[PDB]
Amino acid sequence: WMLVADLITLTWIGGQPVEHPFIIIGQLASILYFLIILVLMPITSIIENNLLKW
Amino acid sequence: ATYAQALQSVPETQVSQLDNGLRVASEQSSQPTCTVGVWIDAGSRYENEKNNGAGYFVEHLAFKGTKNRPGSALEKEVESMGAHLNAYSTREHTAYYIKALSKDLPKAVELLADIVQNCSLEDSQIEKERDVILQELQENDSSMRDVVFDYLHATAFQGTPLAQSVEGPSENVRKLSRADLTEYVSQHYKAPRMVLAAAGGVEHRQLLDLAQKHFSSLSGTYVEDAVPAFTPCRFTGSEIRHRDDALPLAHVAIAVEGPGWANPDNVPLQVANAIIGHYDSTYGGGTHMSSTLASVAATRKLCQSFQTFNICYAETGLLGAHFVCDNMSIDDMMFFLQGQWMRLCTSATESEVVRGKNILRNALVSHLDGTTPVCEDIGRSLLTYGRRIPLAEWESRIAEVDASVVREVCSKYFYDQCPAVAGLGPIEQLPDYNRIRSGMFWLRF
Amino acid sequence: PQDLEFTRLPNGLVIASLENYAPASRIGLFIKAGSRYEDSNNLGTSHLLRLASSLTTKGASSFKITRGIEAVGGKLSVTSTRESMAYTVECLRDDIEILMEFLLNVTAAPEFRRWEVAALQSQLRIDKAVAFQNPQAQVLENLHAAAYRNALANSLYCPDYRIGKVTPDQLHYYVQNHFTSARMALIGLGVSHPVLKQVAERFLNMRGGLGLSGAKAKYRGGEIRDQNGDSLVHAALVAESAATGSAEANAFSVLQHVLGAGPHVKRGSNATSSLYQAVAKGVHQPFDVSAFNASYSDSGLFGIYTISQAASAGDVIKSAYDQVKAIAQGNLSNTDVQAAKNKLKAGYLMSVESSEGFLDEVGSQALVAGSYMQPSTVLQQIDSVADADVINAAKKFVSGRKSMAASGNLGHTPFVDE
Amino acid sequence: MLSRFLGPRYRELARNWIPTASMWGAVGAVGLVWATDWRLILDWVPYIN
Amino acid sequence: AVAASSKWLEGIRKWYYNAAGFNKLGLMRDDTIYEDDDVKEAIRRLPENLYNDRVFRIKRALDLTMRQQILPKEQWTKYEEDKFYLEPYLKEVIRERKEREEWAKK
Amino acid sequence: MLSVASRSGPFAPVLSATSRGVAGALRPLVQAALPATSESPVLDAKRSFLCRESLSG
Amino acid sequence: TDIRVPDFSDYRRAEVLDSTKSSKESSDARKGFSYLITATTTVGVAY
Known part of the structure; x- marks a missing residue:
């Protein structure tokens, strides 16, 4: 649900003009879309594997 | 104490020769029994279409009485000392041999010389050996493996003497006279074409003087003595299909043309066939076996058995495989077998070649166990190589085979070549010859 | 040279080794087990045990x-009789130490896992149907059931109702009670005697003595007839004779070769076989006839075996039985006795030529008698058999109670009381 | 954990297959310019102009 | 493998067992595993009484999810009563796969 | 003293790991084969009888 | 054994009618001929 809220942010930013608050927000949200799928999701499944004693 | 040191302490073979050209060979091994016999260059490839059942007819009359010991008197003498008589006939060789006690050696050599020189082909034993041979032919038709290898020779060597069968057709058996058998012995049972071999508790000096006492009256050179002409035989890619749906299983044999006896390519081609292997449904190994075709057929229950062969003649041969399966499995067995031939022409690894070399070393020493297989190896190596190749020489040829040698020799004999196919039984799912011929080359390499 | 080195261990194990200088080696373990030691509740356990040598052990999967055996080109085989089992390993001389380790895991620490034993049950049906394509095999299993009430009447193959129901607990119980060190012998053929001994001190932690006494076999004079659709009639007719390792057993071995025990010449007419000549006087059709001899540790069987056509089967059995009656009333020449001693002497020396026959011969002597005897001693025991003992062994057959088994079209085959 | 490439026997994986491919990384510089209507290798030789 | 956090890290394990909710459907931990090829070989090797227990527990949980309901709280699977019935059979299947893979490269 | 194969007639089965199953010693005893028409039938679970056990190498 | 292949001489190529050899040799010739007759077709359908 953090990934769904990240795609709502990019839909709002993409209809805004290219100004001061909508460049630092629109480029950090572009980073977090790739950080969740590639890095954060495989590490969190391994942490949940250790907590269930397998 | 070492396998290398044990190959040095094997006793050697001593060869001699008489004035007529007869060779005499022995191996002494310090045991109270022995095996002595006579090996002849004769067979069905020396017969034409008029006398194709001549050499197999003569092997039947060989123990039925000679001039000195008529009728059953030969059989009473062999049995009363506890000895055994045996014989066989292939397409190129003929043998008679005796297993006896090593102190009965002078009597054993005397009986063998009377069998091959003075055998009576009496006209009442003929016309009663015809019906025995005619009934034996009907018994051979129930053996599916013997029928399908006769089909493979008849289609690979179509218009040559090498396509004939050993037994000969049934119309020849009905008409072979006494005159045709006496011409067969005079033309073929000749002393430079014969070998007297012995293994066991034998001294070579004793066998040589027994050979001079009983065999010296053999004709050395002949009347007009023309050189025995050797017509070679060519290979033809072809197929023969015998469809019979009432039989429960199907037999299929396929081969390409292989090398002759004295070709040095024979040793790495036997390392290669030992990687494919053999399988049978009574094996305990099953799905864990090293051979890929054996492990697949055990997991999916594809066949009853398969085997690979290496048949050699003087100038040519057959190199292939034979399998038995049900009517729904022929297309899958042919697909996996042809994929293993192409995977040795390319891609053959060093770890497969180490296993295949260990199999061939074990099969060579396991054959030479007992006086009868040692004596047969002496008698047919002198007709084939002109000498006995010792076990230390076989090991140095095996040790120089590696993975790149196997890839070169398999590509030479298998890759993009026309095979010969034979099939018998419920064979509607045996693939078309165009689809079989396309299986001998790849898309990539 | 180096004839044999024979040794008893303090736990009862027999070790024998002969040092060849042959490139191959052979190791065999011989056990007093097999089908005579099972009872009516676990019939067929020793057939499944014979087929299970490749399963997972504690030391190797x-x-x-x-x-591991195929990587060096070796072999592993099991052979069984009614009284013994034998585990054999062969490879080249430099590979023998790592195949000796595989042989000790199979026989001294097996696991019988549930899913592996359950997948092997269908191999019992394949193995039995292959063996029963020979008509001799089922006739000889019916003959032991007709002759005994117990303990030699059990078949070498599993009964049909029992296929699918041999359990892992039965296999564990059979090995625990019958694979013990005082019932075992270890025979080597290309290995030195110190190497086999420290091999042997790696299976003595369990299996310390004798496990279970078997029941003594009791003779039954029964008869089993099996009508089917085969083209020829197979029949056998026996009586009780003598146990192995006695002076009367040697007289029955000579009597077998007087009568006829197989052919010597390829496609020969069997001129010295007195059984074959007496049948062929009145019968002018295809047949075969032989003398049968089976010797065990506490009993034995001796008789005749005929193969004939259906309409001629009564004539073949009656003329074969009449020839044995002539020997029992004194008609026996010393020329025929001396010719029979030559076939028995030469056949024993020829059966020990190969490595396979020599290793089996040392293994049977170690379990039955617990010692080794040179073949010069065996050849002098055959020489001491007199003509009066051959006639007396044919009188024990003629006056003894008979057993019979037949198969084929039995419309002209006589009953055992006729 | 794709260590099936890392083995001491299948190093000859790539030694029986690359002698096929001695030109096969440059067949686009031999074969595609047959249809591109460019001059990639058309200056290399006086074969073609 | 820390002795100072022996009880603290077992508190996070017991918390995660209740936050996950297969125990509310009456399931054990080995009921919820994803069935790849090694898991499907371990199910085939189970004894007949443990196989039949697993099949009924899964069917009862699929029927509860169809109705969007859970079990009464006295019928939930306890944390220190969950039996890892599949774990000895699965460790042996994987060890056999890794043995056939070292052999294929050596 | 001796084996059951020396005093020939009681039979024995074998199982191998890489070879075929064999039954008995004197069960195919011969000169029933020189008398005419002894046919070994076609089988449904058929086996190889020479079974590599006498191969030349 | 009464079964033999019927004669194929009025279908054979010229190099394999001698019936004595040309088993292994003159085999690269007769299939290298019938591979050229198809290899022109692919460059004939390339263009």
């Missing part, structure tokens, strides 16, 4: 046993 089933993958490593198949791959």
Whole structure:
């Protein structure tokens, strides 16, 4: 649900003009879309594997 | 104490020769029994279409009485000392041999010389050996493996003497006279074409003087003595299909043309066939076996058995495989077998070649166990190589085979070549010859 | 040279080794087990045990046993009689130490896992149907059931109702009670005697003595007839004779070769076989006839075996039985006795030529008698058999109670009381 | 954990297959310019102009 | 493998067992595993009484999810009563796969 | 003293790991084969009888 | 054994009618001929 809220942010930013608050927000949200799928999701499944004693 | 040191302490073979050209060979091994016999260059490839059942007819009359010991008197003498008589006939060789006690050696050599020189082909034993041979032919038709290898020779060597069968057709058996058998012995049972071999508790000096006492009256050179002409035989890619749906299983044999006896390519081609292997449904190994075709057929229950062969003649041969399966499995067995031939022409690894070399070393020493297989190896190596190749020489040829040698020799004999196919039984799912011929080359390499 | 080195261990194990200088080696373990030691509740356990030598053990998995033996080109085989089982390993001289380790895991620490034993039950049906394509095999299993009430009447193959129901607990119980060190012998053929001994001190932690006494076999004079659709009639007719390792057993071995025990010449007419000549006087059709001899540790069987056509089967059995009656009333020449001693002497020396026959011969002597005897001693015991003892062994057959088994079209085959 | 490439026997994986491919990384510089209507290798030789 | 956090890290394990909710459907931990090829070989090797227990527990949980309901709280699977019935059979299947893979490269 | 194969007639089965199953010693005893028409039938679970056990190498 | 292949001489190529050899040799010739007759077709359908 953090990934769904990240795609709502990019839909709002993409209809805004290219100004001061909508460049630092629109480029950090572009980073977090790739950080969740590639890095954060495989590490969190391994942490949940250790907590269930397998 | 070492396998290398044990190959040095094997006793050697001593060869001699008489004035007529007869060779005499022995191996002494310090045991109270022995095996002595006579090996002849004769067979069905020396017969034409008029006398194709001549050499197999003569092997039947060989123990039925000679001039000195008529009728059953030969059989009473062999049995009363506890000895055994045996014989066989292939397409190129003929043998008679005796297993006896090593102190009965002078009597054993005397009986063998009377069998091959003075055998009576009496006209009442003929016309009663015809019906025995005619009934034996009907018994051979129930053996599916013997029928399908006769089909493979008849289609690979179509218009040559090498396509004939050993037994000969049934119309020849009905008409072979006494005159045709006496011409067969005079033309073929000749002393430079014969070998007297012995293994066991034998001294070579004793066998040589027994050979001079009983065999010296053999004709050395002949009347007009023309050189025995050797017509070679060519290979033809072809197929023969015998469809019979009432039989429960199907037999299929396929081969390409292989090398002759004295070709040095024979040793790495036997390392290669030992990687494919053999399988049978009574094996305990099953799905864990090293051979890929054996492990697949055990997991999916594809066949009853398969085997690979290496048949050699003087100038040519057959190199292939034979399998038995049900009517729904022929297309899958042919697909996996042809994929293993192409995977040795390319891609053959060093770890497969180490296993295949260990199999061939074990099969060579396991054959030479007992006086009868040692004596047969002496008698047919002198007709084939002109000498006995010792076990230390076989090991140095095996040790120089590696993975790149196997890839070169398999590509030479298998890759993009026309095979010969034979099939018998419920064979509607045996693939078309165009689809079989396309299986001998790849898309990539 | 170096004839044999024979040794008893303090736990009862027999070790024998002969040092060849042959490139191959052979190791065999011989056990007093087999079908005579099972009872009516576990029939067929020793047939499944014979088929289970590749399964997972405690020291090696089933993958490593198949791959590890095939990597050096070796073999592993099991052979069984009613009284013994034998585990054999062969390879080249430099590979023998790692195949000796596989042989000790199979026989001294097996696991019988549930899913592996359950997958092997269908192999019992394949193995029995292959063996029963020979008509001799089922006739000889019916003959032991007709002759005994117990303990030699059990078949070498599993009964049909029992296929699918041999359990892992039965296999564990059979090995625990019958694979013990005082019932075992270890025979080597290309290995030195110190190497086999420290091999042997790696299976003595369990299996310390004798496990279970078997029941003594009791003779039954029965008869089993099996009508089917075969083209020829197979029949056998026996009586009780003598146990192995006695002076009367040697007289029955000579009597077998007087009568006829197989052919010597290829496609010969069997001129010295007195059984074959007496049948062929009145019968002018295809047949075969032989003398049968089976010797065990506490009993034995001796008789005749005929193969004939259906309409001629009564004539073949009656003329074969009449020839044995002539020997029992004194008609016996010393020329025929001396010719029979030559076939028995030469056949024993020829059966010990190969490595396979020599290793089996040392293994049977170690379990039955617990010693080794040179073949010069065996050849003098055959020489001491007199003409009066051959006539007296044919009188024990003629006056003894008979057993019979037949198969084929039995419309002209006589009953055992007729 | 794709260590099936890392083995001491299948190093000859790539030694029986690359002698096929001695030109096969440059067949686009031999074969595609047959249809591109460019001059990639058309200056290399006086074969073609 | 820390002795100072022996009880603290067992508190996070017991918390995660209740936050996950297969125990509310009456399931054990080995009921919820994803069935790849090694898991499907371990199910085939189970004894007949443990196989039949697993099949009924899964069917009862699929029927509860169809109705969007859970079990009464006295019928939930306890944390220190969950039996890892599949774990000895699965460790042996994987060890056999890794043995056939070292052999294929050596 | 001796084996059951020396005093020939009682039979024995074998199982191998890489070879075929064999039954008995004197069960195919011969000169029933020189008398005419002894046919070994076609089988449904058929086996190889020479079974590599006498191969030349 | 009464079964033999019927004669194929009025279908054979010229190099394999001698019936004595040309088993292994003159085999690269007769299939290298019938591979050229198809290899022109692919460059004939390339263009």
